[model samples]
Target: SMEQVAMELRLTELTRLLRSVLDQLQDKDPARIFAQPVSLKEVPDYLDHIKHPMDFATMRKRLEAQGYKNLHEFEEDFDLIIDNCMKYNARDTVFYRAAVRLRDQGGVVLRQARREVDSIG
Candidate 1:
């Protein structure tokens, strides 16, 4: 029915519905995926070192492994932060949602990287 479709399409209601769905997905007991604050400050240093390093093949494998593992942990943290903020008045809620999506996406990429890495020598 046309009216039924409109009823179902309520944008505000949908927002709340989706938000609730996301909220429920938060684990009451999430596993520790990562252990420390990532050295975002260290990225450029690492890149600079990579430029001069001769043993890059080994480094590449190791770094990608770390990236895959590290990003998973980061994504978990992002999820926790966003879930905790559903009730807080601090920070932009919309921005936090964007961060959540980015973290989830990063995790997806890392998972794919892991599968690809598994086939390597």
Candidate 2:
């Protein structure tokens, strides 16, 4: 329990740092930056899932509604799930396993997306 609490705090700090960087970047380049800006939306509540159960449930519901769409559509969300588990410092659970698989698939999807995006320009 102590470790989980400690991890939640660490994740909250990490989320804050990431948001700070993202805010600065958004200020510099309003366009052509952060195709997944919305991805940041999850980190705050996702990090502190212990405090905000509803937030986590809502996030999960949103993800489920996406219905495991194609890679281009799901990569960011799946990555968020994977990252959440990792950041939350949890292991050896079904959630962790599923997140790992989703992330592994997301990696391939990301590579393909990168190639497609780069080819267009």
Candidate 3:
């Protein structure tokens, strides 16, 4: 009961914030309304090819050291790129694409992470 309430409030805040970002980019192209999954989805597979594979654990630690609480917090970097792209119609940037994915799929990612953590104990 309490957990559900907390989650609902958190979702509300996240939704409101994302909606504000959407409004900020409303005048941009419809294509820019969403993120492309090209590089984001391929990252894990691409890591497989690297001589020194960087797993999520390593990346997570690196990001944390840089003051990021989680991958979702990196959305601000994406937002800045998105703001620039919206101004210039530059949809080719990875930031624009990644931001869209984060904007759209953040809930799913968080839920998956929660499940993974819950399964551990």
Candidate 4:
């Protein structure tokens, strides 16, 4: 049906916009620490504090699986990643600081994606 085609096209555009934003966050990981899940061996208490841990690798998987239906869900995952780092690590740690930077920079790409998605509608 024509409506199905239109929905597919809209989802394609949204996925493209969202993927680009995710890529930006991956690149902005200063020490590339957030590229994968936090290691339990290195940070034993990490999961204990952050039950809903998030990472770029997980986000990529979710994006490919269409686990996120919209940009808002993607943004929430992004926030969760940063929030977990800030909560689990101290302010002086690289992970904590990187989370702070990523949050601000991630916001820029997300805001841009929002404009693109909005203009299309």
- Per TM-score, the best of the predicted structures is 4
Worst 10 residues of 2 by lDDT: 29-38
Q: Once model 1 is optimally superposed onto the true structure by TM-score, how far is the C-alpha of residue 2 displaced, in angstroms?
A: 73
User: How much does each candidate deviate from the true structure in C-alpha RMSD?
Assistant: 18.8, 17.3, 13.3, 1.5
Local distance difference test scores for all models:
0.38, 0.43, 0.43, 0.84
Q: lDDT score of model 4? A: 0.84
Candidates by TM-score, descending order: 4, 2, 3, 1
What TM-score does each of the candidates earn?
0.26, 0.37, 0.27, 0.89
| Residue lDDT tens for model 1, 6-99 | 6554533433432333233332213321222223375445433322221212223433343323334433544544443333223565534544
| Candidate 4, position 7, lDDT | 86
Q: Which residue pairs in candidate 2 have backbone atoms (N, alpha carbon, C) closer than 3 angstroms, thus clashing? A: none
Give per-residue CA lDDT, model 2, range 45-103, as digits (tens). Answer: 54345322222234334444433333333334434545655545468775556556545
Instruction: Give candidate 1's whole-model lDDT.
Output: 0.38
lDDT of 3 by residue, 1-121 (tens): 9998876665554444434433334324244433332243645554343333322233334443444433265444444444433443347875457445544554454455445434632
TM-score, cand. 4: 0.89
By lDDT, highest first, what's the ranking?
4, 2, 3, 1
Q: After superposition, how far is residue 13 of candidate 2 from its true place, in Å?
A: 35
